[PDB]
């Protein structure tokens, strides 16, 4: 299966926490990275005074189970970060999000798939489409269909 996960940073560094998140990525069992967006920025969305985000997306080719994978991924937060209660509301050294598990739907408690936001987020899908511009959606809907509405500025590298 190949596995689309987010990868979002906004503290201590993010190209840092980032190209460190790709290490812990890379040693996930059963799983490879196949590739890697470009990093782009994202200025904060709102009022609130926090760092510019680092924001990718990563192809991991893999044969666990969706929620093993989604083991791993909490696992690598919580092992990088100088995990904090605050960064659920502030900065935050890590986020990895599963965006898309091959074509499958998955809606259950610990875990929705496709991520329940991301067709309202450019630095999802723009650094989605780099890695997999022919993709299309388990509901059917193509990635670059989305995309050409011209509803998503492409964001600026890092
Ligand atoms: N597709 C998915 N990828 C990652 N976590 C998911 C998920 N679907 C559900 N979750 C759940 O989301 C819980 C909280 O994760 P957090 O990272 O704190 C949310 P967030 O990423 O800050 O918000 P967001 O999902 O709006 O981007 C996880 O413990 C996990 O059980
Ligand atoms: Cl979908
Ligand atoms: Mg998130
Ligand atoms: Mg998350």
Redo the contacts with the bound molecule.
Sequence with gaps: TVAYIAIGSNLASPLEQVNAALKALGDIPESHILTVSSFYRTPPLGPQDQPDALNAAVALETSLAPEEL?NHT?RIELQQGRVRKAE?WGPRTL?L??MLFGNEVINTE????P?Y?MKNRGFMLWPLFEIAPELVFPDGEMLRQILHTRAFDKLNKW
Excluded: E, F
């Design positions: 989604l909490q659920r986020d999000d599963i610990r875990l929705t798939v991520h936001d």
